[PDB]
Design a binder for this molecule. Structure first.
Ligand code: HEM
Ligand SMILES: NCCc1c[nH]cn1
Length: 184
């Protein structure tokens, strides 16, 4: 299970974060891991679409080739803190698994600027036992974590050297699908 109440960034700028553009996960910290996809690719788009706050997700295991997209309408808990009931979709937004209660992640933006961010997420999916996951994001998929975001990792009482990089995995992303999924 999840154990963290992550604190949102002071003065979080929601319209800048949710500007409809793409964010790439460059490094992550799973608190509840194992033999799991040690190598992983993930990215999201976040924006307001016809007045609704939205996130589109992409996951790719470059070793198994397991691929999936999700789209959610976010609900606000407080500034920088959201609950997302997700639906699994194909890249075009056609529903594969409909929204259901019990399938949701929370999402806290702990730090963000115009190029980088640190988020916490707690995933819930049916009867499964899942733990916290932190992720370092960047607008550039190949960007090394800079001092702003690494300092924020430290400020969250975490150690960046423990985070796992995705940069070795040779991830390629469909940015266009992620942006268009925001409307679906
Ligand atoms: C912004 C970051 C992330 C968020 C919001 C996110 C959220 C989610 C959601 C919503 C699901 C379930 C999707 C579905 O069943 O339709 C999922 C599944 C999963 N995610 Fe992520 N994820 C993120 C990052 C990552 C990272 C970096 C990895 C690698 C450690 C990871 C590995 C997986 C795994 C292996 C699954 C399959 C879970 C299962 O069904 O047991 N995710 N994630
Ligand atoms: N224990 C990490 C579960 C996960 C996958 N995606 C988001 N969270």
């Amino acid at each position: 299970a999840c154990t963290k109440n992550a604190i949102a960034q002071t003065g979080f700028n929601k319209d800048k974060y949710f500007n409809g553009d793409v964010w790439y996960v460059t490094d992550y910290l799973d608190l509840e891991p194992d033999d799991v996809p040690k190598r992983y690719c993930a990215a999201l788009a976040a924006g307001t679409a016809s007045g609704k706050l939205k996130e589109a997700l992409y996951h790719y295991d470059p070793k198994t080739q397991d691929t999936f997209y999700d789209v959610s309408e976010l609900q606000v808990e407080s500034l920088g803190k959201y609950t997302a009931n997700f639906k699994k979709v194909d890249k075009n937004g056609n529903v594969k698994v409909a929204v259901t209660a019990g399938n949701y992640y929370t999402f806290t933006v702990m730090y963000a600027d115009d190029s980088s961010a640190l988020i916490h997420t707690c995933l819930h999916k049916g009867n499964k036992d899942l733990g916290d996951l932190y992720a370092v994001l960047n607008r550039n998929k190949d960007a090394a974590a800079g001092d702003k975001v690494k300092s924020a990792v430290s400020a969250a009482t975490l150690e960046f050297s423990k985070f796992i990089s995705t940069k070795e995995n040779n991830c390629a992303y469909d940015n266009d699908s992620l942006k268009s999924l925001l409307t679906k």
